[PDB]
Design a binder for this molecule. Structure first.
Ligand SMILES: CC#C[C@]1(O)CC[C@H]2[C@@H]3CCC4=CC(=O)CCC4=C3[C@@H](c3ccc(N(C)C)cc3)C[C@@]21C
Ligand SMILES: CC#C[C@]1(O)CC[C@H]2[C@@H]3CCC4=CC(=O)CCC4=C3[C@@H](c3ccc(N(C)C)cc3)C[C@@]21C
Lengths: 15, 247, 234
């Protein structure tokens, strides 16, 4: 449900 | 416009495909548990590495797409390096301390499921043990690792990045001087420590090469490895330029 | 503070794997794999619901509400049917690649729940239900429970349910047979449908004893007062 770069992106902002 | 006869024909149509559990007979229960548990722990460690990176002085002032990029190039390097350290300090002799509740002994890492990989993670652990690296030395080193890989087309905040990187290199000097003295210039410890960093490029490249050579081994895999496949999305240059302290 | 003081302050506490050697690898795998699969099924069950003729036209909230009350009913029923069609209704066939047999099912970790899951299965088998009949029944499950305090578009909902009750009537007839046999069969399948409330309450009871976060999110948001349970027979 969340690609690696998606996790990094989400973390950089708000999960 | 289109059409289908009965209401059942329609309920029949919208009825969804069968979902697989992703359950392979071949993989033993123990191999699945350990590799499943690491993958989800890995995921959590990435979140934590980013949060951390966002706390790093200097770096956090870099433009966000730079933070992103750097994070994307270095997360494995970072995590692998911290695993080296956790292990180094929870050891004496040759474990991988993935977590407090998940420490793998030498005999476990011998098995074919573990062997190819743990070679490269132990390499980092044993080197920290060889150079008896201090916490200050490691903290600086780990930060340097975040700033160790850059895209060839420039970062958007290159001058900041450059001065950021310098600062942390000077901070490493201060770390070595905390441990050694400064009646010396500590040139060899700086060469030795930087060289370990330079080598993390190799421990990462070997780890990623393993992941590609294991992803391909999953022909027909009823349990598809998107974990080992997503690892190929965020890592696959080529823009990535490795910054080496020693050519 | 020094740069290295900061660097040391902001180091993240070391994460746990959540690993636990008191749990056999056997159980961990089976239940981890189950939980992931179940996760994907719920989602698929929501997407299906959305496509169901009539349901779609209900108020946006009613759809969320009806789904809250039915997902387990849908998921168990489906699993009963897949099991019926894959194993003659005696293995539980969560997925094609994941068949838990009679010997595993009997163990204490899995016994209580699987009794209730196998019931669904064994009973479709016994009633020799068909796909057209099965597909009607499952859409009726989606309309098995309502807010005692009413859905927003209730007369629409009644018409919709009434339409699928009829379609099950047509499904029964498509097999043919006496006008007594079809009344026997309507009774039988409608009794089955009704008995899903108790297999649900039981399968959900075991799940409230997950708790004394994936399924955790839905489980706090559940814990049968306001939800009325539409019965065919009394
Ligand atoms: C044993 C083993 C193994 C591996 O497949 C190769 C390197 C491991 C990696 C190292 C770096 C690392 C350090 C840890 O402390 C636990 C996790 C971890 C891993 C594992 C991992 C798996 C998936 C992710 N994702 C999806 C972000 C992150 C980490 C498992 C890895 C990749
Ligand atoms: C064996 C067993 C068991 C259980 O813990 C109780 C009932 C099972 C449920 C039935 C209904 C059901 C049908 C299936 O086909 C697989 C999954 C499934 C379950 C399992 C389940 C696990 C997690 C969720 N989430 C997070 C939405 C959903 C379903 C496992 C359940 C709950």
């Amino acid at each position: 449900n969340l690609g690696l770069e998606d996790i990094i992106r989400k973390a950089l902002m708000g999960s | 416009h289109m059409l289908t006869p009965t209401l059942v024909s329609l309920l029949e149509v919208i009825e969804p495909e069968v979902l697989y559990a992703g359950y392979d007979s071949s993989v033993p229960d123990s191999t699945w548990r350990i590799m499943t548990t690491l993958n989800m722990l890995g995921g959590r460690q990435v979140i934590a590495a980013v949060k951390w990176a966002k706390a790093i002085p200097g770096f956090r002032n870099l433009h966000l797409d730079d933070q992103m990029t750097l994070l994307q190039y270095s997360w494995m390097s970072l995590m692998a390096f911290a695993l080296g350290w956790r292990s180094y300090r929870q050891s004496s002799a040759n474990l991988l301390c993935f977590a407090p509740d998940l420490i793998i002994n030498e005999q476990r890492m011998t098995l074919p499921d573990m062997y190819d990989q743990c070679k490269h993670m132990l390499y980092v652990s044993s080197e920290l043990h060889r150079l008896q690296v201090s916490y200050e030395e490691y903290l600086c080193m780990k930060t340097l690792l975040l700033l160790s890989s850059v895209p060839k087309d420039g970062l958007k905040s290159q001058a900041l990045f450059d001065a950021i990187r310098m600062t942390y290199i000077k901070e490493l000097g201060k770390a070595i001087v905390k441990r050694e003295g400064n009646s010396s210039q500590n040139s060899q410890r700086f060469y030795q420590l930087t060289k370990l960093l330079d080598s993390m490029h190799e421990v990462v490249e070997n780890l990623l090469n393993y992941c590609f050579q294991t992803f391909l081994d999953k022909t027909m895999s009823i349990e598809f490895p998107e974990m080992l496949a997503e690892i190929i999305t965020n890592q696959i240059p080529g823009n990535i330029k490795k910054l080496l302290f020693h050519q």
